[PDB]
Specification:
Six copies of one chain form a homohexamer. Chain A is of the alpha+beta class and 151 residues long. Chain A has helices at 12-16, 20-30, 44-50, 60-68, 82-90, 103-107, 122-132, 146-149; strands at residues 5-10, 33-40, 72-78, 116-118. The complex binds adenosine-5'-diphosphate (ADP) (6 copies). The site of one adenosine-5'-diphosphate has 8 residues of chain E, from loops. Chains A, B, C, D, E, F: It comes from Homo sapiens (Human).
Chain lengths: 151, 151, 151, 151, 151, 151
Amino acid sequence: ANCERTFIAIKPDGVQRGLVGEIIKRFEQKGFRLVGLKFMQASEDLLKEHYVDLKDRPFFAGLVKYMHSGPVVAMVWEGLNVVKTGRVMLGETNPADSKPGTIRGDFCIQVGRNIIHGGDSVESAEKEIGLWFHPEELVDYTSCAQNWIYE
Amino acid sequence: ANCERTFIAIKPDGVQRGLVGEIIKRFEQKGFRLVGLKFMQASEDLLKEHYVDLKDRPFFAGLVKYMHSGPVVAMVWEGLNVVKTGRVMLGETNPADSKPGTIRGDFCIQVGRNIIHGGDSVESAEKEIGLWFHPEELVDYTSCAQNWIYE
Amino acid sequence: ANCERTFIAIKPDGVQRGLVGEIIKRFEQKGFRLVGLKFMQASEDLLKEHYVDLKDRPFFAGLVKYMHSGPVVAMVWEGLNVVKTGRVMLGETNPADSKPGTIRGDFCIQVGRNIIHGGDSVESAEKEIGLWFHPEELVDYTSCAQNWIYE
Amino acid sequence: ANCERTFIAIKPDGVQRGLVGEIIKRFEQKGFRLVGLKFMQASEDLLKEHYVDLKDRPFFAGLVKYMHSGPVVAMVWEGLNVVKTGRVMLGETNPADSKPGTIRGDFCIQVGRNIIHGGDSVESAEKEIGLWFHPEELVDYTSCAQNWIYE
Amino acid sequence: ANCERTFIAIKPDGVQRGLVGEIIKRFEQKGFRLVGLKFMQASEDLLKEHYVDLKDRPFFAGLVKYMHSGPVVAMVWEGLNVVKTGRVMLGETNPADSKPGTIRGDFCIQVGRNIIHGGDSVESAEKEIGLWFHPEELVDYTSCAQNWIYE
Amino acid sequence: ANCERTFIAIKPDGVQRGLVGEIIKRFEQKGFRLVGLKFMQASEDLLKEHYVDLKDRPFFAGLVKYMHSGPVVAMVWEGLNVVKTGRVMLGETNPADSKPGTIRGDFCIQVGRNIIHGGDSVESAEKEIGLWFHPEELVDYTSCAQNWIYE
Ligand SMILES: Nc1ncnc2c1ncn2[C@@H]1O[C@H](COP(=O)(O)OP(=O)(O)O)[C@@H](O)[C@H]1O
Ligand SMILES: Nc1ncnc2c1ncn2[C@@H]1O[C@H](COP(=O)(O)OP(=O)(O)O)[C@@H](O)[C@H]1O
Ligand SMILES: Nc1ncnc2c1ncn2[C@@H]1O[C@H](COP(=O)(O)OP(=O)(O)O)[C@@H](O)[C@H]1O
Ligand SMILES: Nc1ncnc2c1ncn2[C@@H]1O[C@H](COP(=O)(O)OP(=O)(O)O)[C@@H](O)[C@H]1O
Ligand SMILES: Nc1ncnc2c1ncn2[C@@H]1O[C@H](COP(=O)(O)OP(=O)(O)O)[C@@H](O)[C@H]1O
Ligand SMILES: Nc1ncnc2c1ncn2[C@@H]1O[C@H](COP(=O)(O)OP(=O)(O)O)[C@@H](O)[C@H]1O
């Protein structure tokens, strides 16, 4: 199998446009394991630390504002190449470059309202998971299909 | 509209059998608002208080064991008649009496593995919400469709 | 077979909440033939002639205004007992009494925002059709699946 | 759990209208276990024996001919009360009488083109299983999720 | 946001094979806004003008005849780069060349039966809009979720 | 049109994870004709003759065992370029390289549990068909939608 983890976040447009069940379903049906799940109004401090590598960017302020302007769904998902492949499943950062079949390709249009965030790397995801989740909140268990998902 | 709330819980068979996204989707698409959402390995104490009115019942022990044996998804949903209608959406307690179209009617078979719990009343739901959720964890916001959902 | 027709209209809340395709799907997969399909902001006059019989009632004032406040998808469907069955597929007028699996049961909450209308009798349907559609807009053709839908 | 089985056949109209996957998906998602599956053009002899308790009905000769006019998907499914709950899933003999959420309620219109057959009792269904299948065609395995579907 | 529009037509094969709802649902769920919708049997004249830039092609005469052999669903859709991203959603002219996740990739096989048309440029698409619709048939309204689809 | 055929088999992980109906759906909605469909525990001999060309390789040992450890759904589908397009719909052999919208891209994670097999050439397909099916099990009939799928 593989116990590798990623942080996935449903941005507040996703919640507003009723895409939560649908986004979760796509991770479930793929075979990934739900580790942690929280529905939270997120803070500016939290978001700034998360998006620190983009402090140098003109969109930063607006991004943090858009990211603070409503509830998000904070999620951890476990599996083999889950960081990498989860990003393929999301599609490109810009929805207009995201292929049909992906979450953004199917469900959104404009870069500044792209419904969903995913960990760009394992390093980042761990940083992000810890930042967003306490270790208490992370749940561990075995999928009843595990042996059919992984040899 | 209506700000009435209910506690809905996805029992650990639901999580195991990959029905979370699908169960959430059915509440979203109905028009109900996500208030609170937690993915938690629940305790025996928590469950016993929740299922206290059934202490007198032969299945109680097993129920609590089944309910403790894996992660659950704790949920709060807001809307007009949400307690009552959410129970219709779940179907009957026994899946063999639940009509096709309902969650249990579509997704499960046996009373002791009925994937999902719902608040039997407002009183119960409040008791249950408080029992399961802290007020910090409950999120409040306005649906961008609210005026099309409610006159 | 049968050439019975009904009139189905998707209301503005139905359109605003992105349910047009889902609804049409339900009629298609059932095996009913699409005869007529337009998209329109309905004039107050038309809405008054359409809802004529409910003038006396106290929700007529807000009704016409709300049905004029956005676009409607006006439809004609054909088949054996479309009128009667169409109404069953829609569910009860009040969504609180609408069973899961129905359009209203699955997708809406309050009667003032009940997403859809269907004709209540063959008589009403043909009247509504004459009112919303011009004859030349009703299209005639034979389903390729016809002999598999009807004996 | 339960080792009870039922016989389900997708009739020629169900095959022709593209509902094989949809119908299998409903039995799969319900938790029932697939035991037998075959694709075939049923003989008049087989069909006359299958429908022997109806030889005295006005619709009998046409039923046989219609059922012989294209291929069918014969299936065997296992689970607790799978015969009775399988029938609830199909709907009523008459699609008009079948509720939205049921296979016939959603997917078909006319009694003579009702897309699917199900055993009407445990005894009928085993008689039907022995008739369409050899015991060696029936496959035995255990669902990876069985502990989660049955207590 | 963006007020750019495109023309989309569901071809006779798309109507006949029950994909009207499915196709509308994909544009709806993507965040694009429905502007115009009509159901009609297109004339040879209209179709010859629609396809005027192809009058010199070997497939032209048959394309026109096929497009005239049953009814089509004519639509207008609005949004940022809706013309270009609308084409990405459809797939390639040849279904064989279209990727899973696209409308043609999922729903059809042969180039001469590719179920759907889309404007190939902003200028083509407006020319196509003016040709199939009168400006008064196009409906103006604002999506309740527009702040969440566009920054 | 075209009478080209391919061989598609759902593997035991595909069956165990409840994906049989979903997969068949994908081929149906595309417009390919179901020719053959059986459900079987495949004998080690058959699996060795089937996977003959991969005897040398180091995963052959675990392969046969795993493909014998549960049931497979063996299928024959017909249509223009089924073989080549069928493989595209399936996705790349390794699910990590499989694009969203594909069967493997949507539903599985690791190559050892890649849920499905499709023939890699017309030659292989016909060989596999001769191996898994008896001639009399391949059913001939004409889709009611045929003239709408092919020119
Ligand atoms: N050009 C832009 N304009 C507005 N917002 C942007 C832009 N680029 C990126 N963003 C926002 O910042 C987030 C982070 O950007 P980046 O880390 O480069 O991509 P990703 O989110 O795919 O990791 C994006 O998801 C998006 O919400
Ligand atoms: N006869 C039974 N056998 C095993 N478990 C049962 C039985 N009846 C009820 N339960 C379990 O106890 C839970 C609570 O029962 P009850 O409050 O009567 O119904 P509900 O859950 O519909 O409110 C059920 O959801 C189910 O998990
Ligand atoms: N008490 C009410 N308050 C607000 N709107 C109502 C009320 N009752 C009915 N309506 C609206 O008026 C429409 C017409 O009412 P009626 O003819 O009784 O139902 P239907 O349209 O199902 O035949 C309904 O579709 C509904 O949206
Ligand atoms: N009045 C009728 N006209 C045409 N066909 C009928 C009629 N009644 C029943 N049939 C056909 O005969 C089949 C067997 O009938 P029956 O055994 O009474 O119902 P069921 O299939 O629900 O057990 C039905 O599934 C249906 O296709
Ligand atoms: N080689 C062909 N054979 C039959 N029909 C074709 C062929 N090429 C194109 N067509 C038809 O003509 C339509 C218009 O062609 P074109 O404008 O080149 O593609 P598009 O529709 O992608 O803009 C296509 O949608 C297709 O149905
Ligand atoms: N490195 C590997 N480890 C385990 N199983 C493998 C590996 N490579 C291939 N397989 C399995 O063997 C099957 C046959 O391999 P191959 O013929 O290369 O792929 P395909 O079946 O897509 O043509 C694949 O479907 C896959 O499940």
